[PDB]
Every structure is written in structure tokens, then in C-alpha cells.
Amino acid sequence: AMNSSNYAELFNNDIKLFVDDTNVYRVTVHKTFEGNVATKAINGCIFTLNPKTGHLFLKIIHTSVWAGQKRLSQLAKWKTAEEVSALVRSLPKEEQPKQIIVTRKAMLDPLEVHMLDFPNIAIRPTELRLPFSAAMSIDKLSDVVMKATEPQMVLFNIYDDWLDRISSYTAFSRLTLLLRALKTNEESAKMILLSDPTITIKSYHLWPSFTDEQWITIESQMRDLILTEYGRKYNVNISALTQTEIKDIILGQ
Amino acid sequence: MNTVPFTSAPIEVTIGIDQYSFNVKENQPFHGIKDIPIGHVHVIHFQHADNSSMRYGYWFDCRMGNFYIQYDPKDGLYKMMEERDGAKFENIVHNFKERQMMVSYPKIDEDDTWYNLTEFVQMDKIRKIVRKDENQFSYVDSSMTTVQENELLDPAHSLNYTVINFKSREAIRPGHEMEDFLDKSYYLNTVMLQGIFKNSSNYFGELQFAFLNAMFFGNYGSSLQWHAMIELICSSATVPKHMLDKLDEILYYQIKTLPEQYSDILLNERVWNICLYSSFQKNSLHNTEKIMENKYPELL
């Protein structure tokens, strides 16, 4: 079980993948003519990330895979496990993960069962609350998912080129801070990210091209956003908060 | 109407014979048990008064030979042996009977309990689970581990029960992962019944044997096996009707016979709640559910 105590393990040289299934089965709920409620599925995705390298394997889940199926929320866990196991089989042996960490414990059985052929790959849950559900708030990721007309894998580096300048530990911290802000107040977070138009996003990147000094500013702005939202939610005057209290709230996980 | 004589009773001991038991004093003039009903396997078991960790016994069938018990002061236990001299055996037995130094296996003809607990249990199957080919009877005790237990998963000192593992390649067909994990019918019907047990009678026989070893010896691996075999049936959407009906009867008599005091050590809450209330077969076990609810409500 992965937790705040064995966190550095994420950045060692043993290949590992996080798998988050939150956005696999996505629906809009609406009323029918007779006044009953019905769901309409929209495209989803499995978010599979190597936290050391930033390589993201985004498997797009096209709505056609739900056609004529029952118990979709259950099915979605098994579909996720089928696709993760297919991805593992597709990788050369030296690229296969030694561990797969699932963000939600309900994924453990489905994945364990689909991975029986790989007895040496550890499947683990985590005590960390990770903000990966917010991946669909990244515009280019949302775009590719919504445009897909058939099942499709797309590969990204979710750290852009940050690893040229910072460590994986720092890159993951930056990523989870950004995603935590996007999850907490998407509109505000995007405004912080996309306000100064002189700072653009390269065609081959997901995030803007901030300098080292600008990332420091961006990051404190995101921390302030998270704190401000925390105070708005619980009706607390964040003025009184201490530096220690502040850090915990920011970390979420 | 067969007899298992005892040479003597040199140490104080509680002796069980099937579901019955009685205490014998150190050096009490006790020379065995007579009137043992022919046609069923039986188990004679022991718990020493001075050391309750000494908990062990022998499964046997008198149709298969003349057996007796003799205490071994070196190994410190009552041992079963076979007497090959028929004439010598009948003469010992006659003399012990004439002197009325034997307990009678308690009758009461209206009672089918033992038959109901051992209906499918056969000595030849027992001998494949407990491997000691030189003897016609089988020793079991409270500490023997099962082949499945061993690690994470003397040969005669392990219980070779059939391994059941819900997350194994054996249980799950490639391409049917979700189907097979959520509905164990393939694993039950094709792998276990057709493939390994050959028939439901053999399956029930191992289930019954596992329960009895758990109850009489407090053998933990046996309790694991008993629960696994129940769960596999209840977790299958497709089971022949005659098997579900028989299972209800089997479990009814097992729950009926269990000491209400050992309910907490012998019954797995998670498994029973799933089996009676959530499983595919939650409405197929009417008798069992009724006795459980009335006898062990604090369990569910």
C-alpha cells in the first residue's frame, strides 16, 4: 500500500505505473419525455502514468464500448483492467512495470485477475488522495478524448520538458498541485495558467512555457487558490491559519 | 456392530467416538467401544486431560479390518493399530465384552445425525487426502496443515484437500476474466465437478470430511476448505438443482451439530453472510438459513 511514508519509491528506478479509472465511464444525466431520468454516455479515458518519466498512456474509451452492456459502473472497472493488461503485453519486457498502483481500491480485483499471466507484477492500492480525475481539465487531453470516433491510444509526456530542469519528485509535486487546483476551482486555475498571453503553450506541450521564476509565482498562486477555496467551503477565515495548517490542506493527499 | 478394543487407558483422556464423547480416568478399567454401526466411516478422537494441545484421532471403517487402540508411552499418545490375527481379535473382544469393560456406541434409532454428516464420506477418499498407505485408517490432528496452506500456497502430516483459489488461472479462462470471476459456474462445473471430483458425490464427501476435521480437531485448514467449497457453489449462477437441494441438507445437519459455544471459532462471518444473503444461491438454502438465523443470529 502506497502512502505518504513510502512516497520516494515513486521516483526510484523500478518501473511503475499509476492507473486512474475515474474518467472511464462518463455520463450526463437528463430527463426523458415521460419525465424519467436517463443517462447518456460520453467518451472517457484511462489515465496510466509513469510518475518517474511523465509518460502518460491515455487510452480513450469510446462510447461504443458500452452499447448493449449492463451494469456499466462495474463493467468500467473490468474494461480498465483489460486495457491496462493489454498495454502491459504490448510493451517490450524491459519496459513492463514492476508495480501498478491503482488510485481506487475497487480496481484491485479486476486488475489482479487480468494480470494473472504476470505473477511478478505487484498490484497495489494507495492511501494517497491523488487528483488525477482532473486530467480532463487539461484542454488538450479533453480535446483528444471528445474528438475520438473510435477507441484510440494517445501518448503524452505530462511533464512537458520540466525534467530538463527539475527532478521527478519535483515534477510530480508540481503536477499534483496543478491538478489539485484544477479539481478545486477549474475556472480560477485556468485563469492563473492562461492569463499572461505572452506565455504560450508549445504545440507539443500541455502546459505553458513558464520560466523557473514564473513557475514559482504560478505555484504560489495555485496554493493560494486551494487555500481560498478551502476557506470558502468550510466558512473559515484563512487569515488565522498557521503555516503548518496551510501546508496540509495544500497537500490534500 | 463392530468393536474397537483398547489395551488399556494409562492416561486420563476425553475420548470421542463420532459425535459422542466420554471421560476416562488414569488407569481406569476401560477396554474400548462396542456396537459401532457398520456402513459408515467413524472417527475415534482424543484430548489428553493434562494437555489439551494433544488433540488427534483416527478415521476408520470396521469393514476394512480389525482395529484396536493402544497407548504408546514413548510417543505419548493413543495409537490405532490393526490386528491381523482374526481369532486372536475376536477372543480379546469377547473377553472384554463378557467382563463389560466396554462403552456402547449410543443408539437411539430415530437419530440419523451421523449418517447425515457422513453420507458422502468414503474411506478410500479419506485415504487420498491423508496419505499413509501402510495403514487402513487415517490419523488427523489439530495442527496438521493443508497442502494449500503450506507456505503461502512427513507426507502423512498434511491434508491434501483439493486446492480452491478464486484468483488462479485454473479458476479463470483467458478472455472470460470478468465473467468467470463474477460467476464461478465454469470453475465449479467444468474444472471441479467434471474435471477433478468427477461427480458431486465426491465433492460433497470432501466438504463433509473438511467440516468434520474442523469440528472435531479444531483444524483451521479444514475450516478454510469447508468454507471454500460452500462459497464456490453459492457463487455459481448455474448449479444442478439436485446439488443445491442436497447442499441445503448437508449444511443444515452440520450447523445443527456444531456446539453453540464454538460458533465463533468455526463459522466465518463474511462467507456465511455472502452465501446466505448476497450470493446467486442466497434463496436456495432455505433450511440452512432458517437454522442459522435461529441458532446463530448474532453471527449474521
Swiss-Prot record, chain A:
**Compartment(s) where it occurs, according to its Swiss-Prot or TrEMBL record:** Nucleus
Consequence of substituting D21N:
Reduced growth at 30 degrees Celsius. Strongly reduced growth at 16 degrees Celsius
Annotated region (RNase H homology domain) at 6-253
Please tell me, according to the UniProt entry, what happens when changing T22A. Reduced growth at 30 degrees Celsius. Strongly reduced growth at 16 degrees Celsius
Q: What is the effect of changing D21A?
A: Reduced growth at 30 degrees Celsius. Strongly reduced growth at 16 degrees Celsius. Strongly reduced growth at 35 degrees Celsius
What task does this protein carry out?
A: Functions as a scaffold that mediates the ordered assembly of spliceosomal proteins and snRNAs. Required for association of BRR2 with the spliceosomal U5 snRNP, and the subsequent assembly of the U4/U6-U5 tri-snRNP complex. Functions as a scaffold that positions spliceosomal U2, U5 and U6 snRNAs at splice sites on pre-mRNA substrates, so that splicing can occur. Interacts with both the 5' and the 3' splice site, as well as the branch region. Has a role in branch site-3' splice site selection. Associates with the branch site-3' splice 3'-exon region. Also has a role in cell cycle.
Please describe the quaternary structure of this protein. Answer: Component of the U4/U6-U5 tri-snRNP complex composed of the U4, U6 and U5 snRNAs and at least PRP3, PRP4, PRP6, PRP8, PRP18, PRP31, PRP38, SNU13, SNU23, SNU66, SNU114, SPP381, SMB1, SMD1, SMD2, SMD3, SMX2, SMX3, LSM2, LSM3, LSM4, LSM5, LSM6, LSM7, LSM8, BRR2 and DIB1.
Additional remark text:
Present with 468 molecules/cell in log phase SD medium.
Q: What is known of its domains?
A: The MPN (JAB/Mov34) domain has structural similarity with deubiquitinating enzymes, but lacks the residues that would bind the catalytic metal ion.
In Swiss-Prot or TrEMBL terms, this protein is called: Pre-mRNA-splicing factor 8
Please tell me where this chain falls within the complete protein, as first and last residue plus total length.
Answer: 1836 to 2086 of 2413
From Swiss-Prot, chain B:
Q: What is any Pfam family matched here?
A: AAR2
Residue positions where Phosphothreonine is found in the record: T257
Keywords per UniProt: Cytoplasm, mRNA processing, mRNA splicing, Nucleus, Phosphoprotein
Tell me what PTMs the record reports for this protein: Phosphorylated on serine and tyrosine residues.
Gene Ontology cellular component?
A: cytoplasm; U5 snRNP
- Residue positions of the PTM Phosphoserine? S236
Xref: InterPro entries? AAR2, AAR2_C, AAR2_C_sf, Aar2_N, AAR2_N_sf
Where in or outside the cell it occurs: the entry states: Cytoplasm; Nucleus
In this chain, the stretch annotated as Leucine-zipper covers: 244-265
Additional comments on file?
Answer: Present with 7330 molecules/cell in log phase SD medium.
UniProt subunit comment: Heterodimer. Interacts with PRP8 (via RNase H homology domain and MPN domain), competing with BRR2 for the same binding site. Component of a U5 snRNP complex that contains at least the U5 snRNA, PRP8, SNU114, AAR2, SMB1, SMD1, SMD2, SMD3, SME1, SMX2 and SMX3, but is not a component of the U4/U6-U5 tri-snRNP complex.
Family from the record: Belongs to the AAR2 family.
Protein name as it appears in the record:
A1 cistron-splicing factor AAR2
* Organism, as annotated: Saccharomyces cerevisiae (strain ATCC 204508 / S288c) (Baker's yeast)
According to the entry, what is the taxonomic lineage of the organism?
Eukaryota, Fungi, Dikarya, Ascomycota, Saccharomycotina
